[PDB]
């Protein structure tokens, strides 16, 4: 029943910065408390054990600290090969408790704003008997985004699953697709289909729009 | 847990004479694992306060227990008599091989009536083993995530707290040093009397009392090298069992670790503590058949 | 060298049952605790439980207990994580670790883990993907690019491998990666952005494969 919280999640850094991950436990827990690493789609790489010992062959730019709820990993100078998702667990209580969600390490210097295009559900999808109504937030920064649909002002929720792309290797951008679900029934009882985009570049909601008279 | 195996029970024994005519045996494994399950038993029933009362029907049941295997061991007095006034022909020769041979077969004769009573003591020993492991299946908690340790706790600081700080009050290493000091004067004063000194007598005798010291300190050695290991090991570990929860499988975990590191720790300490005595013990003998500094 | 080697990817329908397995090689099995960290697609790791090789004993999350089940056999050095009771949700990928880190006494750290298993929950059989296309539109603003694309649905299993123009246009291709529906069939986009200046021109073609149905459907866009 050890609760481990990583601050921040999510979070921005340029090569060279300096890398201080946060990770606090629900209770006490000593210096029990391991690191890892693990670059997309790999096995985690243990880096730290026991708060601040550092695992033999590891780069010596990560540095483990914090006692007691508050731990800290730090990499001295980020580099390019550290662009990881990073994970801290506690030992502490052997059911070894999951690990805190876990923190993301992009590039930084966009805040690029997402180029928003709405597609319509294709004249042939729609004979089928559905409608999924597509949405492209192309090439933006940060990776934190909100996006909502809209039929005929109502909010809408869940007759929607997103999908995100991995940060450009080059360019460095991430871009996002949001994908409404309905019946044909569904789809052939509203007018207007709003696509509602906020983000760190938007001054104001953005959102496209067509009607069903699409023509 | 701990189970009893097969081990060559030969060496599985120390013969140990504290005083001049008390001499008594071990048996190393027994005494852990008897030991083992003494800790387990009480850890069991101080885990909650509900069950602290055990602690008299407990008392009962190891000073039972321990009544019952003395008993056993008994059935070897006349043979471990009969090897005492062995030793005291060697230890008070005021002839030599048959004297030698004397003890190594009224020795052998002990070895063997020992082995001998091997399931006699498995029995008390499996007893054991029942009471202690029939507690510890008792050992219930008020929630399993999240048991209390203050169980262990108490138990650290009645039963063995008061025995790590009297072995850091006394320096083990110390103790060591002078018995290798006492040897360098034995070992001195017999390479004085070699020589072609004519021949003087005994020496046969003195050689025996010496060789038989050295294993002794060997054995100190031993077991005060595992005293001190533990000590630090008894004491980190302890810290890490208190003043905390656990998982109920995580505890049961600890204990019987503690269990273990406890019972192999007391163990070396007794031995440590007799073969002390017996070391001296010898010094006096030795020390008596030279008479004074020179004859 | 020390190696953690698991079991190749399964796929079991709703309410079924799933071994995976993890072979230890390279140093002593019994000596270090396995455990196995599952991870749902894009999400944490989570642990599942673990066992003493050498005991057989099992300490197993509350999330899986009574649905997991670990074992191992010693001829071989491979531990194994038996799920049941099978959920969409169980959709992850099972890694297995090695605790062989004891840092202090009873504490110790997951050194060594295998690549990790792919394990799929849908109830889907092999079915090809239905390609609709992205019928263009033009930028904030009708500003310069437009982007178009191929919806890819209702497939199963993985993979899909969308190009463009016969692997020509690679330029401003995102083809996302697919989301596992409420229908155990996947879906996903594969978008492209190009100048508005070439329509009339340019054609606009998506290529997609799905080799597990041997389906390899194209489907022109073209605005409207």
Request: with cysteine.
């Given at each position: 029943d050890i609760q481990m919280t990583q601050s921040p999640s999510s979070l921005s850094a340029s090569v060279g910065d300096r890398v201080t991950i946060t990770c606090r436990a629900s209770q006490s827990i000593s210096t029990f408390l391991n690191w890892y690493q693990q670059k997309p789609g790999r096995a985690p790489r243990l880096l730290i054990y026991d708060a601040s010992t550092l695992q033999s062959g590891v780069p010596s730019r990560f540095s483990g600290s914090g006692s007691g709820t508050d731990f800290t990993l730090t990499v001295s100078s980020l580099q390019p090969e550290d662009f990881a998702t990073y994970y801290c667990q506690q030992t502490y209580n052997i059911p070894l408790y999951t690990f805190g969600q876990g923190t993301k390490v992009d590039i930084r210097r966009t805040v690029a704003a997402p180029s928003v295009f709405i597609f319509p559900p294709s004249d042939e999808q729609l004979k089928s008997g559905t409608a999924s109504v597509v949405c492209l937030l192309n090439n933006f920064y940060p990776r934190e985004a909100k996006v909502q649909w809209k039929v005929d002002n109502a909010l809408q929720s869940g007759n929607s699953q997103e999908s995100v792309t991995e940060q450009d290797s080059k360019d460095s951008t991430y871009s996002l697709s949001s994908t409404l679900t309905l019946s044909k029934a569904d789809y052939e009882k509203h007018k207007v289909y709003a696509c509602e985009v906020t983000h760190q570049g938007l001054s104001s909601p953005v959102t496209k729009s067509f009607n069903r008279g699409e023509c | 847990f701990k189970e009893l195996s097969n081990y060559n029970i030969a060496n599985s024994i120390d013969i140990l004479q504290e005083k001049e005519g008390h001499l008594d045996f071990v048996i190393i494994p027994h005494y852990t694992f008897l030991d083992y399950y003494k800790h387990l038993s009480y850890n069991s029933i101080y885990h909650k306060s509900s069950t602290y009362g055990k602690c008299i029907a407990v008392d009962a049941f190891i000073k039972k227990i321990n009544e019952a295997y003395d008993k056993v061991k008994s059935k070897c007095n006349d043979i471990k008599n009969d090897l005492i006034a062995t030793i005291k022909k060697l230890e008070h020769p005021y002839a030599?091989?048959?004297?030698?041979?004397?003890?190594?077969?009224?020795?052998?004769?002990l070895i063997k009536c020992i082995k001998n009573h091997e399931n006699d003591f498995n029995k008390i020993c499996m007893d054991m083993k029942n009471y202690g492991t029939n507690l510890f299946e008792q050992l219930s908690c008020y929630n399993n995530n999240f048991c209390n340790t203050n169980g262990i706790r108490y138990h650290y600081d009645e039963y063995i707290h008061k025995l790590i700080l009297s072995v850091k009050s006394k320096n083990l290493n110390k103790d060591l040093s002078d018995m290798t000091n006492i040897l360098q004067q034995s070992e001195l004063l017999l390479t004085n009397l070699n020589k072609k000194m004519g021949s003087y007598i005994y020496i046969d005798t003195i050689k025996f009392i010496h060789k038989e010291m050295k294993h002794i300190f060997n054995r100190i050695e031993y077991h005060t090298k595992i005293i001190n290991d533990k000590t630090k090991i008894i004491q980190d570990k302890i810290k890490l069992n208190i003043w905390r929860t656990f998982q109920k499988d995580e505890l049961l975990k600890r204990i019987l670790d503690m269990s273990n590191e406890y019972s192999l720790f007391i163990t070396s300490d007794h031995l440590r503590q007799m073969l002390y005595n017996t070391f001296y013990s010898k010094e006096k003998h030795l020390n008596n058949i030279f008479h004074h500094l020179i004859y | 060298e020390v190696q953690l080697v698991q079991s190749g990817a399964e796929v079991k329908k709703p309410g079924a049952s799933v071994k995976v397995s993890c072979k230890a090689s390279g140093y002593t099995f019994t000596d270090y605790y396995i455990h196995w960290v599952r991870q749902a697609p894009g999400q944490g790791l989570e642990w599942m439980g673990r066992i003493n090789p050498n005991s057989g004993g099992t300490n197993y999350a509350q999330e899986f207990q009574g649905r997991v089940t670990m074992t191992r056999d010693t001829s071989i050095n491979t531990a194994y994580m038996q799920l049941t009771r099978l959920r969409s949700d169980d959709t992850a990928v099972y890694y297995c670790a090695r605790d062989g880190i004891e840092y202090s006494y009873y504490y110790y750290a997951m050194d060594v883990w295998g690549k990790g298993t792919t394990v799929t929950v849908?109830?889907?059989?092999?079915?090809?993907?239905?390609?609709?296309?992205?019928?263009?539109?033009?930028?904030?603003?009708?500003?310069?690019?437009?982007?178009?694309?191929?919806?890819?649905?209702?497939?199963?299993?993985?993979?899909?491998?969308?190009?463009?123009?016969?692997?020509?246009?690679?330029?401003?291709?995102?083809?996302?990666?697919?989301?596992?529906?409420?229908?155990?069939?996947?879906?996903?986009?594969?978008?492209?952005?190009?100048?508005?200046?070439?329509?009339?021109?340019?054609?606009?073609?998506?290529?997609?494969?799905?080799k597990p149905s041997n389906t390899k459907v194209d489907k022109k866009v073209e605005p409207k």
């Open positions: - | 030599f091989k048959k004297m030698m041979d004397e003890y190594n077969t009224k020795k052998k004769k | 849908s109830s889907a059989s092999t079915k090809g993907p239905s390609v609709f296309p992205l019928a263009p539109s033009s930028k904030s603003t009708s500003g310069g690019t437009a982007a178009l694309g191929c919806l890819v649905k209702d497939y199963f299993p993985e993979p899909v491998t969308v190009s463009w123009n016969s692997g020509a246009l690679t330029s401003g291709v995102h083809t996302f990666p697919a989301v596992l529906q409420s229908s155990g069939l996947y879906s996903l986009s594969s978008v492209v952005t190009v100048p508005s200046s070439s329509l009339g021109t340019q054609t606009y073609i998506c290529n997609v494969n799905h």
